[PDB]
């Protein structure tokens, strides 16, 4: 759901601005995580974090801990996927926006 891919991109950009967090300096990292969130949202109904493995994804989405923005990000601003990085982080660039073109390249592959 390409509408969902665009909705997820907008979410990421708005959430980064609201939390004073920044995207990875390598925006393809960001794009891969945004595409995984959308994929999960299409498959499972919720944006289950894409940079983890699970024993039971349906149970995870019901529990809600790892649905984006996850518990660790909401409470401690910790994002294991490196989608939302605090300004001090070595991998933080300066963008809080990602060109749609960049996500389209990840859909291309």
């Amino acid at each position: 759901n390409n509408k969902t891919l665009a909705a997820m991109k907008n979410f990421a950009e708005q959430y980064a601005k609201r939390t004073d967090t920044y995207f990875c300096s390598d925006l393809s990292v960001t794009a891969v995580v945004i595409e995984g969130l959308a994929r999960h949202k299409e498959e499972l109904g919720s944006p289950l974090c894409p940079c983890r493995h699970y024993e039971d994804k349906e149970a995870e989405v019901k529990n809600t801990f790892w649905n984006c923005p996850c518990v660790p990000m909401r409470e401690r601003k910790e994002c294991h996927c490196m989608l939302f990085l605090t300004p001090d982080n070595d991998f933080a660039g300066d963008a809080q926006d990602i060109p749609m073109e960049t996500l389209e390249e990840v859909k291309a592959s």
Partner: protein, 73 residues
């Protein structure tokens, strides 16, 4: 560990959702609350929450912890 246990946050845990410090960094170390849940499964299906101990504090505030960050009062 049990639901209902009183615990003290003994590790330094910096959070951003406290109702008195909305959006700003606040260390919960030293605060005391009660265990409200220990997340190990959702309807019999093991789940992977990595901050499984949900602790309720005063002022309608709750936060999640690893078992090693809290101490049974």
């Amino acid at each position: 560990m049990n639901v209902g246990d009183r615990v003290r946050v003994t590790s330094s845990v910096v959070v951003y959702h406290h109702p008195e410090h909305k959006k700003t960094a606040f260390d919960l170390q030293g605060m005391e609350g009660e265990v409200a849940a220990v997340l190990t499964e959702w309807q019999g299906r093991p789940i992977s929450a990595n901050l499984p101990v949900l602790v309720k504090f005063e002022q309608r505030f709750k936060a999640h912890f690893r078992p090693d960050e809290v101490t049974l009062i």
